[PDB]
Amino acid sequence: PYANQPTVRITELTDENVKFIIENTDLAVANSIRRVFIAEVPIIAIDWVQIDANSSVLHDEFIAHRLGLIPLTSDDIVDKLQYSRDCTCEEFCPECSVEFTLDVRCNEDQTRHVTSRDLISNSPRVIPVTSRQDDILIVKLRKGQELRLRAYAKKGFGKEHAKWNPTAGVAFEYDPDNALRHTVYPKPEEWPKSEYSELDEDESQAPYDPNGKPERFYYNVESCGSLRPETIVLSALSGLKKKLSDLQTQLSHEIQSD
Amino acid sequence: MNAPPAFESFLLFEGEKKITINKDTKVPNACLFTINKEDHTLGNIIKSQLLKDPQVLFAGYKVPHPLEHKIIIRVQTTPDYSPQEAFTNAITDLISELSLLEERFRVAIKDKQEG
Amino acid sequence: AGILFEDIFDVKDIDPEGKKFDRVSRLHCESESFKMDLILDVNIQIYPVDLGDKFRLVIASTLYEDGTLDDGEYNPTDDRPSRADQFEYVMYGKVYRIEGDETSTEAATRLSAYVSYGGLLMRLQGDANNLHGFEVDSRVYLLMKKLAF
Amino acid sequence: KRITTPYMTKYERARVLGTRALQIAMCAPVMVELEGETDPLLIAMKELKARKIPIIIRRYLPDGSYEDWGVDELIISD
Amino acid sequence: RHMCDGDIVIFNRQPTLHKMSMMGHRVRILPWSTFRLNLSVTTPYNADFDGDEMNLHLPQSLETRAEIQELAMVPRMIVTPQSNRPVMGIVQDTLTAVRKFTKRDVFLERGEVMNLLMFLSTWDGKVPQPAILKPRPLWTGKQIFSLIIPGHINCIRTHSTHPDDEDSGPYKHISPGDTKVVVENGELIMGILCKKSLGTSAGSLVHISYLEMGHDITRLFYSNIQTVINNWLLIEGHTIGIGDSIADSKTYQDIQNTIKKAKQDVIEVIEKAHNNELEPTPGNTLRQTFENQVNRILNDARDKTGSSAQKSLSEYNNFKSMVVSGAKGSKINISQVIAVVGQQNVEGKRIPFGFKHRTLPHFIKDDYGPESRGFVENSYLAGLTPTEFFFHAMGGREGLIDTAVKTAETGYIQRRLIKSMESVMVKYDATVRNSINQVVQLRYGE
Amino acid sequence: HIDQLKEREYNNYSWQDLVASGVVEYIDTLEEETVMLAMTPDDLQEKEVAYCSTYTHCEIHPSMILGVCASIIPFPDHNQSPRNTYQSAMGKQAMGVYITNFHVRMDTLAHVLYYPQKPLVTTRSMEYLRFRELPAGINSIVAIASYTGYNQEDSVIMNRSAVDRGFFRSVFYRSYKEQ
Amino acid sequence: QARAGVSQVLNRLTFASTLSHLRRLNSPIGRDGKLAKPRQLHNTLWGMVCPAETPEGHA
Amino acid sequence: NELIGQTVRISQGPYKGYIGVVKDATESTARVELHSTCQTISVDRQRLTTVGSRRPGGM
Amino acid sequence: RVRGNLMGKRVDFSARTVITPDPNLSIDQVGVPRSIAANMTFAEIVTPF
Amino acid sequence: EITPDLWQEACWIVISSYFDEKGLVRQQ
Amino acid sequence: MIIPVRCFTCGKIVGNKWEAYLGLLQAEYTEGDALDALGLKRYCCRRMLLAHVDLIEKLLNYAPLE
Amino acid sequence: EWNIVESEKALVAESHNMKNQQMDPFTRRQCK
Amino acid sequence: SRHGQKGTCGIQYRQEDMPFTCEGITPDIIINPHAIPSRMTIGHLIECLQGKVSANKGEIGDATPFNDAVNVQKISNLLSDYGYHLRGNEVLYNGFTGRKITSQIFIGPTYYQRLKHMVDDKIHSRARGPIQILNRQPMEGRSRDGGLRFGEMERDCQIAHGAAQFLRERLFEASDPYQ
Amino acid sequence: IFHINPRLPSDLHPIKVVEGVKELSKKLVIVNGDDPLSRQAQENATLLFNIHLRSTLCSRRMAEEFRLSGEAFDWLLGEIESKFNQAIAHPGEMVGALAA
Amino acid sequence: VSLMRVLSEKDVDPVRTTSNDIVEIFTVLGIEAVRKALERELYHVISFDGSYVNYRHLALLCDTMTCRGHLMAITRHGVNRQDTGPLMKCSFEETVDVL
Amino acid sequence: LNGLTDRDLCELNECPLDPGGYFIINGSEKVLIAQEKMATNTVYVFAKKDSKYAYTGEC
RNA sequence: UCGUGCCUGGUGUCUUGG
Ligand SMILES: [Mg+2]
Ligand SMILES: [Zn+2]
Ligand SMILES: [Zn+2]
């Protein structure tokens, strides 16, 4: 009447993506973790832009929008910050934000590549991804055009805006061989083999397995650089566990108060 | 112009309850749990965990409208078992799973890294 | 009791009209002792049969040996000893037609009992007396099991 | 010698409900017990089932005549 | 006060063409700038969501709200007096999905049933005894669809694939194909559902439901159908791809063979008329009998190639599944996609001699052949030759033309009708009179 | 001619030299009445059982029958002809960058799409329409699926996370005047 | 008494509308016309006139 | 009321950090056009802080 | 007058917008956007109720 | 040479040059 | 106007890859190898660089001053 | 320039692939 | 679309909620399949098919109308070299549950257009706005804060209803009341 | 509804059908009145439904085909009339507007 | 059409010989035959495409069109010559003139 | 703006891609739509059977 | 120590929406 007992197996670990295998768990748990990687892990991202001088060829909000989508190195700091909506400060705090600053003037003759290099942070850790390969192009300036703005980065998660999604792409997969027949091929031999297929080159799909659950969920979590690809995972497990703990608290209140 | 602000999917208003238990009347030992500011993330794992319970006759979840951020969880158990405690168990042991998974993932990391 | 019918049957054809659905096939059969004809859909996916297979088919009114006539709702959580524990394939359905060789004057000698297991049709057909247990809109169970002989 | 249909027409039902609901909203005495509702149409509907609507329908005939029908007299349809 | 959740409004798509073009709805407030409709209400409004807009009127009185509630509210409007048939049916991917849902080989586990029952409004809260218990508890399509069906309906219908020669032979009451829909006691016993059973036809299951049960219980029946089925369709899914457009390399050969035979056939008709042996088929000139023979040949050709297109399709095909559900499309739409497009007509004839004795400059003077007068011999999959591209356009222009003229003329006929019969009504006399009290009919409809 | 014309700009040769050399000819609709016209160079001028064997002219490319808005359709020949017409019409409503100097314009209404893309599947004749320089649309990863009903009847379900990333984001400029 | 709509405001919505407005042809035939023979795609538009680009309205 | 037409910053609640201008105000609430989104919101007047927009030195 | 201003008028307490499908409403429901609802009004008599 | 079966390349070169010489709006 | 910061579909950063991509087309590469050498595996992200039309280069010709 | 190179070295494949003209999905007119 | 496939955005789901391939490629747009069969826009499918080839081969595809070196078998054989289903179909996981969809979804890159008809320029609503000076009824138009017309056709539809109080409300009381 | 079981012999007197149909025919009133001119028209107006009624509610079909009990037949009669009366053209209806 | 010279011919069914032109039917067979024939014509143009319209509406139009003895046309030359009253007439056509 | 380079067009703040072919009239871009007509000086023959004429020749 | 408030455009034509 109780929980199943999952096992993990990291297959590939880089500074860009993680490949791991989860065994002995429900399909629902294995997918809910996928939802949380995308939408419910916190990161730091630009979310407030005060434009002082903008003379570029783009709009005002175009600049601000592009600044929003730049990933910021979050790992050490994001589980320390308050959400902005939760900080006691009347404006912004180092406890609830990181302040950014862009000041660029094209004086020279050649065109100016406004890159993420120009975003000057007040915190040495919450920078754009420059540490160790070009830089995110913001604008291009001509002879006499400029851009002055200050920006703030706050904590958020992908359920608000895609800007806080830490992932490139999450590659979820289960049952590489059609053992459950969860999917029904009209012509099962027209189909290329999975990456994970424990099958020979003779047969097309695994024989039908009547009594059987999904296990062995294959993941490929790819970082946008805002976190390490293995931190996205520990954070999502902690996020989902935290939603449930919170839920339980609210539940217990509901129970005892009826 | 009419768009909901994006914080409306997770942020509780003033007066809104997280969770809301309603005794169902049409069969004995049945409840309806109404979660606010939740979606298919939280509703699916609870459902699937509830299906593991042998004392649970029925378990399910719905999203009444994808524009309105709320789920309904209907639980029916055996007369010796309240859906209150069904629901409680299916969070308790599911947290126990995710904690054990987090622990196991951690060691697997530190083994991967030079090992 | 509540044993509306029983005989051994064999699979004379698996789907002689040609396989019309992927997970389901039209078994055609005759019975060993009462010489009943049978047509029966089965879940050929979870319970496969070939030609020339033998099975003991027990059409029942209830599942419980004492004949206590259950309600018609699903309850998995049940201690009471069932008929299903000695079978391999068990289904639940309605007899939706009974049809026969009645004349204007005299009675019938042969009946076709037609039942739907939630969509999976069956026609059991032969001696009216061996089929006297069936009445239209009654609920019924299939209880079949393959004979390894 | 009333010759008209003994049934409440859908149009009669509509305007009687509407009319009575208006009166209700204007602080009329109710002719039925309120189990704790507040909508004048809900009330009017309740009253209708009780055959307690204090209204008679004057039905005009093509010749120029008319027939008056109490609400409690004629057979309510829905 | 502001308009709020549970208010009545009366809601309209112009052009208003019939009584069912304006209907009373309950309001619900939602967070984005569109109006929202349940999709069975599309069919009466003739709506599209393709950039359609609709007008909302809010009644302004107790006396007017009540009137709409009792005369115009959507479920009151299910059966039109025009044709004594439902106006509202299950008409998109619910219909497509319901065919697929009610198939014989559709099996659901406890996790999917109990998930699907959440989307019933009318459920008594009891899980039905699964159609298979051992080796594993499995429900059915029909068995869950039996909970959706309200009350104790009884009806019989034929699914679209129903073979004519079935009702004669054996297996009459036990269909091999799971055609022959049977509802008893409000339970689905036999048959796949489609447009023939869930559509807008006299005696469809949604019609029986309205004659039998209320208008209210019938309202819950449409809503359940959509909600349960759309939810199931998250499991099953539906799609249409390239793969659903390929024949099977034998069919290609059959088509090409048929086509060549056809092209061959027409050459002899051309020879006979070119050597004066085509005798005028009584009731015709020479030039008419010719055109008839040709069109016969070509139409035969299209029909034959259409048949081998249908016969080639796997049961997993996605065009087929939308044709046999009646959701969208017809058997000729498959024919045109896979096998052949066909003969392109303008004004009922073949492509005219627009240039001097020829259709295009590419052709030759006095060219009556199939290619030369609009017979598209390719498929939409293969693509169209340049010439037959043009001809295809010529034909498809007709429809656009007729559309633009049909809108202007019919709208005036409808107006004149209404003005010559606006005051005609059923007096308490139970007689049908006009504005002058002149008796039209002694009884309505005799 | 192909060799001189391939090496144009690097030498002064041009379309008018094909005219002056008597290679290509402008034919009026009223003169097109009299041509015996081929539709490809090779395929119509080979040796079989005879169609004509008296061809006078050839088409340059049969896709030149199409117009401006119609020549942006990929595979128009795989379409029901009214569909091509609809697209012909809607293609004039497509947001893009409407002209290069739009930030100097004070036009009463204008729409500039944020991130317009070049088509991934183009016609050869959409080069000369300068469509790849000034495009009006985005290559979207389309699925064709009955996902959860909300696309059901000429509707589409869009990605919110893609829209957050600027997918189909636009500026609507409105402009006002007074003297 | 004059012809009307002969000059029109150039459509600056997209490049493809600019380009297409500049290459537009118009028919003098009045509206309120129940006749089809002027609205039909003639065999002889081949290569001259787009057999695809037309308004779906009354025009 | 005094601050109608003035530039304010939302300092509390879900909209923390959003700038706008007061379009209307009461004894307890204000309507603020947010500078960023195409929307006007109603907010408790105590959630606001005046920012102002001035230049000094006027010489 | 008779066609333009009498047999058909312009009316208050009315709205229009693009329609989108919504399978989660009942057949008798129209979902309305918040500003249409916040615009249009219903005169509702005051009662001790 | 009078027989290029290189034609879906050669063809679009005459197209390109037509369009280099005469614009799209040449008729105006 | 200017290369998007992220693949709209997946969310991978492509904003930094446009200069590099044109640099790999200064080298004699097929676009297919340019996209591969930059590491764009998905057919979402690969569309961003194939399909991006660089109009900021044209807008830059309209000098404000000098 | 490389598209000129690419298109000429590619379309000669329709002259070189001489052995296998077989596949179906394409048609063409053949009159009289 | 580029094929005559108009449609309104019916809902927006986030990337957590969209379906997904064996990698995390959610759709950008999901269109209902019922658009294709009646309309016979095969070119859309082909485009979605070739766009897939174009993105993986990393070279922009060719969709010239009358080409005949292009067909669907040829594209398909190319597609199958990149490790895809030859027909463009894929195996999607459902975004809510994570479970595979039993149908293989047709998915690929297609060019989409945003049309100028945004809803926030069409949404309109009225209660006691301005009045015409001549006859005291609501003005016309969205910009003039006008009212909807309750025309003749609407009027016939209420007579047919027998909703005569509503008829007199729309035609008297909610329009131009006078004494 | 009554669980007929069309395989047992029924208890429905062949005369209760003959006389119940006669009494039912009375209750289906379109033209009210006892006048000969009114009776004639009442008879006329309900001629086809009466034929139908008399052709499905036989004594022989009721016993060789339907096998209706007595309680089922009383239910039936009440049902028929209750339905017919609902199908009456409502006074006030704008039938010409519908016709148009 | 001629109808009367046709009916009179020998070996020609003077019972089942219909005319399609409803005006010939009015002149030769009289108003109650027009009513029947008009419904037959109007039912043909309706059901040809396979669609079905309820009899009430067909009976009703054919009744209104044949209620004053003369064939009453659904245009100003018919419905406004009927003695209906001026405020009815002026809504339809002829607005100034009938007032 | 004639025989004028991309550099010069950019320096005039005018588009190099702009086709031309339109008028500026009070700061509005106007296009003349090509009105079609029956060709001059060319004899035609038609059947206006709705008249005293079996055939009419026209010029 | 203060007390004032609904102004407010008509006409034509082309384009485009379902
Ligand atoms: Mg539409
Ligand atoms: Zn703070
Ligand atoms: Zn990507």
Distance CA E182, CA E157 (A): 7
CATH superfamily of A1-42+163-258: RNA polymerase, RBP11-like subunit (3.30.1360.10)
The neighbouring-strand residues paired with A50 are A150
**Which residue from L7, L10, L14 is facing J5, i.e. has the nearest CB?**
L14
Nearest to C74 by CA among A76, A211, E140, N2: E140
Q: Which residue is nearest to nucleotide Q12 (CA to C1')?
A: G4
Which architecture characterizes domain D1-78 according to CATH? Alpha-Beta Complex (3.90)
Distance CA M175, CA A176 (A): 66
Nearest to E116 by CA among E37, E237, E226: E226
Relative to the alpha carbon of A96, which ligand is closest?
A: 2
Closest nucleotide to the alpha carbon of E48, via C1': Q18
Nearest to C44 by CA among C69, C27, C57, C61: C27
Chain B's closest residue to H14, CA to CA, is B7
Judged by a CB distance cut-off of 8 A, whether residue I22 touches chain F is yes
Nearest to E178 by CA among E99, E279, E268: E99
Q: Cβ–Cβ of J20/F15 closer than 8 Å? A: yes
Q: Is it true that domain C5-148 has CATH number 2.40.50.140?
A: yes
- Give me the CA E314–C1' Q7 separation in Å, rounded: 71
- Give Cβ neighbours of residue N72 (< 8 Å, ≥ 6 apart): N1, N2, N4, N12
Judged by a CB distance cut-off of 8 A, whether residue L24 touches chain M is yes
Judged by a CB distance cut-off of 8 A, whether residue A208 touches chain C is yes
Strand Q bases, protein C-beta under 7 A? 7-11, 13-18
Nearest to B87 by CA among B49, B57, B54: B49
Relative to the alpha carbon of A224, which ligand is closest?
A: 3
Distance CA I19, CA E49 (A): 6
Whether residue M129 contacts residue M141, with contact meaning beta carbons closer than 8 Å, is answered with no
- Give Cβ neighbours of residue O38 (< 8 Å, ≥ 6 apart): O22, O25, O62, O65, O66
Ligand 3 is an ion; its neighbours by CB within 5 Å are: K 7, 9-10, 12, 42, 44-45
Ordered by start, the domain boundaries in chain A are 1-42+163-258, 43-162
- Give Cβ neighbours of residue C48 (< 8 Å, ≥ 6 apart): none
- Give Cβ neighbours of residue D46 (< 8 Å, ≥ 6 apart): D32, D34, D37
- Give me the CA H1–C1' Q1 separation in Å, rounded: 20
Nucleic strand Q within 7 A of Cβ G28: no
Distance K11 CA to ligand 2 centre (A): 28
Nearest to O98 by CA among E415, I2, M151: I2
Burial of N4 (0-12, 13-18, 19+ CB in 10 A): middle
**Rg of chain F, C-alpha, whole Å:** 23
CA-to-CA dists, residue I37 to E69, E210, I26, M21, angstroms: 19, 32, 19, 40
Distance H20 CA to ligand 2 centre (A): 19
Burial of A113 (0-12, 13-18, 19+ CB in 10 A): middle
Nearest to A197 by CA among A216, A172, A177, A181: A177
Ordered by start, the domain boundaries in chain C are 5-148
Q: Cβ–Cβ of B64/I34 closer than 8 Å? A: no
Q: Cβ–Cβ of M16/B66 closer than 8 Å? A: no
Which architecture characterizes domain A43-162 according to CATH? Beta Complex (2.170)
Backbone angles phi, psi at N8, to 5 degrees: -95, 155
CA-to-CA dists, residue B107 to A9, A23, A239, C112, E38, angstroms: 10, 15, 19, 67, 52
Distance E35 CA to ligand 1 centre (A): 14
Distance CA E446, CA E442 (A): 7
User: Which pair of structure tokens corresponds to residue D40?
Assistant: 């004048």
How many CB atoms within 10 Å of residue E27?
22
Q: Strand B21-23 relative to strand A173-174: parallel, antiparallel, unpaired?
A: unpaired
CB < 8 Å from E in window 3-62 of O? 51-57, 59-61
Long-range pairs for N28-36 at CB < 8 Å and ≥24 separation? N28/N81, N28/N84, N28/N85, N30/E430, N30/E443, N30/N88, N31/E430, N31/E443, N32/D3, N33/D3
Burial of E386 (0-12, 13-18, 19+ CB in 10 A): buried
Going by the DSSP 8-state scheme, the letter that residue D73 receives in this structure is: T
Distance G17 CA to ligand 2 centre (A): 50
Distance A154 CA to ligand 2 centre (A): 9
Distance CA A9, CA B109 (A): 9
Is F154 labeled as catalytic in the residue annotation? yes
Annotated binding site of E for Mg(2+): 48, 50, 52
Chain K's closest residue to M26, CA to CA, is K9
Distance CA F115, CA K56 (A): 11
Distance CA H49, CA H52 (A): 9
Q: Which domains does chain K have, with CATH numbers?
A: 1-66 (1.10.10.60)
Ordered by start, the domain boundaries in chain D are 1-78
Number of domains in chain B: 1
Nucleic strand Q within 7 A of Cβ M124: no
Which of F3, F43, F154, F164 is an active site residue?
F154
- Find the helix or strand (DSSP H, E) in which A156 lies: strand A146-157
CATH assignment of the domain containing B13: 3.30.1360.10
The neighbouring-strand residues paired with C42 are C25
Going by the DSSP 8-state scheme, the letter that residue A82 receives in this structure is: P
Q: What is the resolution of this structure in A?
A: 3.0
- Give Cβ neighbours of residue I15 (< 8 Å, ≥ 6 apart): E55, E56, E58, I32, I36, I39, I40, M124, M125, M126, M148
- Find the helix or strand (DSSP H, E) in which O12 lies: none
**Which residue from H9, H17, H36 is facing A84, i.e. has the nearest CB?**
H17
The neighbouring-strand residues paired with C95 are C115
Chain M's closest residue to K32, CA to CA, is M58
Q: Cβ–Cβ of N95/O61 closer than 8 Å? A: no
Q: Cβ–Cβ of B54/C77 closer than 8 Å? A: yes
How many CB atoms within 10 Å of residue C143?
24
Distance CA D13, CA B61 (A): 41
Q: How far is CA A176 from the centre of its chain?
A: 25
- Give Cβ neighbours of residue P59 (< 8 Å, ≥ 6 apart): P41, P42, P43, P44
Contacts of E27 in chain I (CB under 8 A): 29-32, 37
Nucleic strand Q within 7 A of Cβ M74: no
How many CB atoms within 10 Å of residue N54?
14
Q: Cβ–Cβ of L32/F49 closer than 8 Å? A: yes
Q: Strand E35-37 relative to strand I14-21: parallel, antiparallel, unpaired?
A: parallel
Chain L's closest residue to M67, CA to CA, is L26
Backbone angles phi, psi at C51, to 5 degrees: -55, 150
In order, the DSSP letters of E97-156 are HHHHHSSTT-EE-HHHHHHHHTT-SS--SPPB--SEEESS-BEEHHHHHHHHS-TT--EE
Q: Strand G25-26 relative to strand P34-35: parallel, antiparallel, unpaired?
A: parallel
- This structure was determined by cryo-EM
Q: Using omega within 30 degrees of 0 as the cis cutoff, is the peptide bond preceding E135 cis? A: yes
- Give Cβ neighbours of residue E230 (< 8 Å, ≥ 6 apart): E93, E94, E97, F148, F149, I23
Nucleic strand Q within 7 A of Cβ E105: no
Relative to the alpha carbon of M6, which ligand is closest?
A: 1
Ligand 1 is an ion; its neighbours by CB within 5 Å are: E 48, 50, 52
Q: K35: left (phi > 0), else alpha (psi -120 to 50), else beta?
A: alpha
Contacts of I33 in chain B (CB under 8 A): 2
Chain O's closest residue to N96, CA to CA, is O60
Q: Cβ–Cβ of M97/B40 closer than 8 Å? A: yes
Distance K46 CA to ligand 3 centre (A): 6
The alpha carbon dihedral of N5, N11, N14, N18 has a sign of: negative
Relative to the alpha carbon of M55, which ligand is closest?
A: 3
Chains H and N touch (3+ CB pairs under 8 A): no
Distance CA N72, CA E366 (A): 77
CA dihedral M129, M133, M136, M139 (to 10 degrees): -40
**Which residue from E11, E226, E230 is facing I30, i.e. has the nearest CB?**
E11
Nucleic strand Q within 7 A of Cβ M6: yes
- Give me the CA H2–C1' Q4 separation in Å, rounded: 18
**Range of the structural domain that residue B103 is part of:** 1-115
Distance from CA of E140 to the nearest CA of A (A): 17
Closest nucleotide to the alpha carbon of G31, via C1': Q14
